[PDB]
């Protein structure tokens, strides 16, 4: 409908796949080469389905900060025959607050879904499903089961992936440029 939705659509149309694990179907953001991200609660194993194709997992790393606290981001390298468009230049370098974000989801359940979530707070610490978690972004939208892995964007920046909610607020794990240096 406007420039926020434009940037979000551009990311969804080229940099997402549908990932299926034993724990469900997730929006999965491809960042560069064969490297993607997914919430750690997806429990990625040795094999994952990518757009309903059986795919070997070459590497999976559940990120933690240097306090050894959960960040809820798993970086996956996929044995796929095709590279993602490199979007690392759209990743923030530092922790920050944002105005006017969009949460975008693409699964069998919720195809072509875009949600204007408004102001995004650098929330920091969250007890996420009983797990102490750092680098959490918060938005005041009643997000639902099926939106985990959703991409959070502003115009020109990919800032996070949706990892949970409490019925009134939604929570995303930050993406930082420093996670994807190679």
Please outline the helices and strands.
Elements: H1 3-15, E1 16-21, E2 24-32, E3 35-39, E4 47-50, E5 53-64, E6 70-78, E7 98-105, E8 113-128, E9 131-139, E10 151-154, E11 157-165, E12 170-174
Antiparallel strand pairs: 1-2, 1-4, 2-3, 3-6, 4-5, 5-6, 7-8, 7-10, 8-9, 9-12, 10-11, 11-12
Catalytic activity: Selective cleavage of Gln-|-Gly bond in the poliovirus polyprotein. In other picornavirus reactions Glu may be substituted for Gln, and Ser or Thr for Gly
Subcellular location: Host cytoplasm
Protein name: Protease 3C
Structure description:
It contains 1 helix and 12 strands. The chain has 182 residues and is mainly β. It folds into 2 domains: 113 residues, no CATH class; 69 residues, no CATH class. The strands form 2 sheets. It has a 6-stranded antiparallel β-barrel with strand order 1-2-3-6-5-4. The radius of gyration is 15 Å and the shape is globular. Interacts with host IFIH1/MDA5; this interaction inhibits host IFIH1.
Features:
2 domains, 53% strand, mainly beta, Protease 3C, 182 residues, 6-stranded antiparallel barrel, 6-stranded antiparallel β-barrel
Overall domain count = 2
Report how far the terminal alpha carbons are from each other: 36 Å
Could you give the count of β-strands? Answer: 12
State the major sheet: 6 strands, antiparallel, barrel
Radius of gyration: 15 Å
- Based on Cα principal axes, name the global outline: globular
Helical proportion, percent range: under 10%
């Amino acid at each position: 409908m406007g420039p926020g939705f434009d940037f979000a659509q551009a990311i969804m149309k080229k940099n997402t796949v549908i990932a299926r694990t034993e724990k469900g179907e997730f929006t999965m953001l491809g960042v560069y080469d064969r490297v993607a991200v997914i919430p750690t609660h997806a429990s990625v194993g040795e094999i994952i389905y990518i757009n309903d194709v059986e795919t070997r997992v070459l590497d999976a790393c559940a990120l933690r900060d240097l306090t050894d606290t959960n960040l809820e981001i798993t970086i996956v390298k996929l044995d796929r025959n095709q590279k993602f468009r490199d979007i690392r230049h759209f990743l923030p370098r530092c922790e920050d607050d944002y105005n006017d974000a969009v949460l975008s989801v693409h699964t069998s359940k919720f195809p072509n879904m875009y949600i204007p979530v408004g102001q995004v707070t650098n929330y920091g610490f969250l007890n996420l499903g009983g797990t102490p978690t750092h680098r959490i972004l918060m938005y005041n939208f009643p997000t639902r089961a099926g939106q985990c892995g959703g991409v959070v964007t502003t115009t020109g920046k990919v800032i996070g992936i949706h990892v949970g909610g409490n019925g009134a607020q939604g929570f995303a794990a930050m993406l930082l440029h420093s996670y994807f240096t190679d």
